[PDB]
Design a protein around this nucleic acid. Structure first.
Ligand SMILES: [K+]
Ligand SMILES: [K+]
Ligand SMILES: [Mg+2]
Ligand SMILES: [Mg+2]
Ligand SMILES: [Mg+2]
Ligand code: NA
Lengths: 129, 42, 85, 198, 92, 150
RNA sequence: UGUGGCGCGCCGCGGCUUCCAGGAAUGA
RNA sequence: AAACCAUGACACCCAUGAAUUGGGGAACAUCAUUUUAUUUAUCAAUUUACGUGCCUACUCA
């Protein structure tokens, strides 16, 4: 059965961008999925997306602009101390010049660059570049 | 027995109120009837 | 054929052929009918996919036959579909 | 005076002009109308509010009433609003029930005990249903633009277009005034297949 | 079975007696609506019950099972050779 | 996939988005409650009550009018079944299979199916004991279960 | 201005009595 | 056991043309009797079209 909604959604987006599609449909939706997409959109990696209501878990349609190379989830959600950001950047990112690691902290869901500014650790959710 | 006693007491309490304190509102229906019956003017 | 498909606003033809529960928003396939049997001038509401035994209030005779899918009405009866809302 | 029985007990001592005017119309409607003659003697309103904007030249009149009478009002609506509009030219009359909202607690144990009718999401969507009541929502979408802006759109059945389209710009203003949230409206011919009118 | 379902309904909202002696008692008093006889009944005891029912104008249903099956159809752990229904409840 | 098989079946009903009852119903909430209680008196399960209302009296859902579910209505009126309906229907099927196996001792296919049904029963009973719908220390036994069933 | 659409309106009654909490539950 | 698909179970995405086995819908047969729109268009507001053979001098609408 399906055990992770976030992992399912990120696999659908990465698969569609590999095939050069313009839109992708994601089902089911969740609060964590929407927050993850808002971080990607703020940095300019996807574009506009829309949520459709069906009185159950919703559906999401995402528009892709072709700037996203790969996104993925990290399972299980390992803890990350504020001094451990460099270790994760070295392991799962193409370089130290671009790309983001997404964390869930007591201040909310954010990328690793913002978390370093606020000096907070948390649990690693995923990445995109 | 203690559980039964408390249950019986609650039933009496729900019977005292919602039957006596409520349905007392015949006081205001009497006042409303008086207003409609009165004020005949003429 | 120059028009491109939008996933959030499907065309009439594309959405018309889809299985229910495969549409963008799932919904029913059935409806209700206003059936008048021959005699007794009575009007009764019948489900389209009715599998139980349906009889008029007075005549106490069968009004439809259960099948796989849509029920079949007795020969003497006529029906009018009722509005959704 | 007998017409003051249509106001809540606290407002009876020193009523406002708008509340007094509405109360007078309701009492006259009590003994005059045929359908409204029943189910009216059990009804009384809380307060009356008025809103307007430089655009939407018509004026909005909002009437709030206790939540107990929601079943009473539902059967009576589509007629009470028609007669009230006749006696108040230049105004559009809206009936909304007064509801309470429980602030979201922080403990997980406290959250499990919250009554779901007092949730903010549930309350706001019920206020929307109190507006445009004879019609119903056939769809709802949220749009997230490239900038942080977020929009909510509500679709109505296109069969009621002739009877509700004139009041849509004013009803969105009232919804914003009561909930501090913005809503956009659209019409859907064939809601089963999600076809948007144009 | 059709008869098995009706017996369950009577067990829930009706009146009845189980046994030969009590069934004959209700037949004499004329408060019997239906008598169910198992296939296991001894031939001379069955002949007596049928004669009583003809005198009292009471219908008879011949059960297909034996007294072991009839007893379990009433939610019982024992056997019953005959069942007499005195008050059909929300049943038929 | 099915719990105890290899089938991938998708057949099911799809509830509508609009929950308000149609304007032509003209049936009060009290009338619906009365019709539900009458059928339960006749001895019908909650599933069969819903189909009978849907097929003949034009009520699509008993929750959209009266705001209550069918089993909740029966519990309030005190006419709820002693054990859950789905559990009862499984016990009845196992009883019929055992009766057939008494005469036919070479039916290895039926013995296999009996294993699956009894496994389903024990899983169902475990859930109902946890949510306190069955009394604790309630057990299913093949010898006793012949009673208390159709 | 006026035209054209506008929606609402344009076993029945009767006094008394006793009993009665039985509609507030996220969605499927 | 070459107990073999020499390929563990559950779940998601996935391009194309001919076929096939079971069920259902449309059709056949049986009964019954939106605005608009003079000056338009960026991803359409309706591609839903179509007949044959057998058939009471009944496991059959
Ligand atoms: K081996
Ligand atoms: K097959
Ligand atoms: Mg398994
Ligand atoms: Mg389900
Ligand atoms: Mg091997
Ligand atoms: Na092989």
């Amino acid at each position: 059965t399906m055990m992770s909604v976030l992992a399912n959604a990120l696999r659908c987006i990465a698969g569609a961008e590999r095939r050069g599609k313009r839109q992708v449909l994601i089902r089911p939706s969740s609060k964590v999925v929407v927050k993850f997409l808002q971080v990607m959109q703020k940095h300019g990696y996807i574009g506009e997306f829309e949520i459709v209501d069906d009185h159950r878990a919703g559906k999401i349609v995402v528009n892709l602009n072709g700037r996203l190379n790969k996104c993925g989830a990290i399972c299980p959600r390992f803890d990350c101390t504020a001094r451990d950001f460099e270790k994760w950047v070295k392991n799962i990112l193409p370089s130290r010049q671009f790309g983001f690691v997404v964390l869930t902290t007591s201040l909310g869901i954010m990328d690793h660059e913002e978390a370093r500014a606020r000096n907070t650790g948390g649990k690693v959710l995923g990445f995109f570049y | 027995e203690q559980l039964a006693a408390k249950r019986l007491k609650d039933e009496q309490n729900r019977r005292k109120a919602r039957k006596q304190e409520l349905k007392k509102r015949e006081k205001e229906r009497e006042r409303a009837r008086r207003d409609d019956a009165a004020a005949a003017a003429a | 054929g120059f028009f491109d498909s939008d996933l959030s606003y499907p065309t009439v033809r594309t959405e018309r052929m889809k299985h229910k529960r495969r549409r963008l928003v799932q919904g029913p396939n059935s409806y209700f009918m206003d059936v008048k049997c021959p005699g007794c001038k009575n009007i009764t509401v019948v489900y389209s996919h009715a599998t139980s035994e349906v009889k008029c209030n007075g005549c106490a005779t069968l009004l439809c036959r259960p099948t796989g899918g849509k029920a079949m009405l007795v020969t003497g009866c006529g029906f009018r579909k009722k509005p959704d809302h | 005076q007998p017409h003051l029985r249509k106001l809540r007990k606290l407002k009876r001592a020193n009523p406002s002009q708008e509340e007094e005017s509405v109360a007078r119309v309701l009492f006259e409607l009590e003994g005059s109308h045929k359908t409204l003659r029943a189910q009216l003697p059990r009804f009384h309103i809380n307060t009356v509010r008025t809103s307007s904007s430089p655009r939407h030249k018509k004026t909005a009149m909002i009437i709030l009433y206790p939540l107990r009478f929601i079943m009473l009002v539902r059967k009576i609506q589509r007629t009470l609003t028609a007669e009230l509009e006749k006696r108040f030219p230049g105004n559009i009359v809206v009936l909304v029930a007064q509801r309470k909202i429980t602030k979201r607690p922080n403990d997980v144990y406290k959250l499990q005990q919250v009554q779901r009718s007092r949730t903010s999401v549930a309350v706001f969507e019920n206020i929307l249903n109190d507006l445009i009541y004879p019609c119903d929502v056939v769809g709802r979408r949220w749009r997230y633009r490239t900038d942080g802006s977020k929009l909510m759109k509500v679709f109505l059945d296109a069969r009621d277009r002739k009877r509700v389209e004139s009041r849509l710009p004013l009803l969105a203003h009232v919804y914003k005034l009561l909930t501090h949230r913005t809503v956009t409206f659209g019409f859907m011919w064939n809601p089963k297949l999600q076809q948007v009118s144009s | 079975d059709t008869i098995n379902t009706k017996i369950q309904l009577v067990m829930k909202s009706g009146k009845y007696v189980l046994g030969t002696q009590q069934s004959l008692k209700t037949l004499r008093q004329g408060r019997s609506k239906l008598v169910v006889i198992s296939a296991n009944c001894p031939p001379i005891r069955k002949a007596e019950i049928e004669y009583y029912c003809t005198l009292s104008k009471t219908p008879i249903h011949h059960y297909s099972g034996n007294n072991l099956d009839l007893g379990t159809a009433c939610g019982r752990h024992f056997r019953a050779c005959v069942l007499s229904i005195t008050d059909v409840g929300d049943s038929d | 996939v099915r719990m105890h098989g290899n089938g991938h079946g998708k057949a099911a009903s799809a509830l509508p988005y609009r929950r308000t009852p149609p304007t032509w119903l003209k049936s009060s909430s009290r009338d619906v409650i009365d019709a539900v209680c009458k059928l339960a008196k006749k001895g019908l399960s909650p599933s069969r009550i819903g189909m009978q209302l849907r097929d003949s009296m034009g009520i699509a859902q008993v929750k959209n009018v009266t705001g209550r579910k069918i089993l909740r209505i029966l519990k309030h009126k005190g006419m709820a079944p002693e054990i859950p309906e789905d559990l009862y229907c499984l016990i009845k099927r196992a009883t019929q299979m055992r009766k057939h196996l008494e005469r036919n001792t070479k039916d290895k296919d039926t013995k296999f199916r009996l294993i699956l049904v009894e496994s389903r029963i024990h899983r169902l009973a475990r859930y109902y004991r946890r949510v306190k719908q069955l009394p604790p220390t309630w057990k299913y036994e093949s010898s006793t279960a012949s009673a208390m069933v159709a």
